[PDB]
């Protein structure tokens, strides 16, 4: 399990770090829907969509890479909590229109970015 | 490096014992604003209350006529790097 | 660079905790994998308590805040895994549990953030 | 740890040119089922078709009377560890 653990941590660290750099640079530009935390969910949602289709077509890939890419990169790149507090803070500011908007865009947007990365690779192959 | 401090704090309507202040919201997600007011003259107690983050005006009442007050506003805002923290104050003087 | 370490150290812990929890438990109820739910409910609790608590201690080392939030909560919580499960349910035609999974993850994590917040909030009062 | 192969694949009704098969879904998010069929004598093109993850029965049609068919069902299933992947088949033989 130690080799697995290294994949989680390496992929995660690359993910967490990327989310951090993107968030501090871009979030404050549109507080009603902080775009840094959106893009890292739209991005990792895209990545996991491609992984969905590619892993399927590559039954023999080393799991170390699959774990590092999904639980690691995508698990560390995406966030449910930062998305959560922003909505929570919007709610407490009484900015309900943007709290609700924030939820729809993140949820429906991730799925789309997933379906995107999935149906791109499908069609490629 | 986006300011959480409000700007253009001003009195827009006054009675001898009340003030109506307005400010411009900082470009962040303010949860509520804190308003504080005391007599500019020395050791009078300063008083405060909150106003919700949507509002950007606040009535101050129960003042003494022809007294100089120091009015101060700052925010409890959500930012990504700080979560819930407080802005620095913006401050004006006004005499009833 | 010291911030980098907090994200990594925190994220690694959060990612590692997400990995162990989900493997052990997701398979027990595939219509709404409970490992992925719990990490998201739990990080939400942490970020709610961290919200109320950090507000009251504006002298604390930002290192510790970043480790707990962007790091641990960022690593522990996951959006892609929640999204992937939904997508899988959606492709499988299991709409009702795709919908449920969204409500339960979003409504659930907001309720958990609010508890963590208001517990600390009510504690100090 | 949880098996992604269907169980209890069986012909539940037959004519001489068609079979209604059914199976027990495994304990995983099955995205869709694949049904394969061909003549057991190593000399017919195996055909595969899909049925949605919610169904557990399928109709195999256009068959020859009196012939031995091998019929298999496997899943394209989602799991945490592997994302999407194909399961091992469950297979039966059936004479029409
Ligand atoms: C569907 C998923 C639900 C999951 C759980 C969501 C939890 C939401 C927490 C909201 O927090 C409250 O929000 C009020 C409204 O924003 C605030 O009222 C403040 O702001 C109001 C609106 O401007 C004023 O009317 C109030 O008097 C003033 O106290 C109040 O302080 C705050 O504690
Ligand atoms: C699914 C559950 C959804 C509902 C969640 C709870 C919403 C209602 C909260 C009721 O208690 C609130 O407590 C706040 C304090 O915690 C008070 O805010 C007062 O103090 C706050 C700061 O503590 C300020 O932000 C507010 O603007 C100010 O009105 C507020 O008056 C009061 O009503
Ligand atoms: C809230 C929106 C979020 C963003 C969009 C997410 C999209 C997720 C579903 C897309 O995948 C498709 O889902 C269909 C429905 O599950 C499947 O239909 C399959 O299953 C159906 C089940 O009724 C059959 O009728 C179809 O013929 C059969 O192709 C189809 O294969 C599959 O590729
Ligand atoms: Br966070
Ligand atoms: Br994942
Ligand atoms: F995502
Ligand atoms: Na995460």
Residue numbers in the entry:
A (entry chain B): 1 to 125
B (entry chain C), D (entry chain D): 1 to 96
C (entry chain A): 2 to 126
Source paper text:
Microbes are protected from the cytoplasmic accumulation of environmental fluoride ion (F-) by export of the toxic anion via fluoride channels known as Flucs. These small, homodimeric ion channels are remarkable proteins in two regards: first, their unusual ‘dual-topology’ architecture, in which the two subunits of the homodimer are arranged antiparallel with respect to each other, yielding a double-barreled pair of pores related by twofold symmetry; second, the Flucs stand out among anion channels for their extreme substrate selectivity. In contrast to most characterized families of anion channels, which tend to be non-selective among anions and sometimes poorly discriminate against cations, the Flucs are arguably the most selective ion channels known, with >10,000-fold selectivity against the biologically abundant chloride. The protein possesses two deep, aqueous vestibules with an electropositive character due to an absolutely conserved arginine sidechain and a deeply buried sodium ion at the center of the protein.
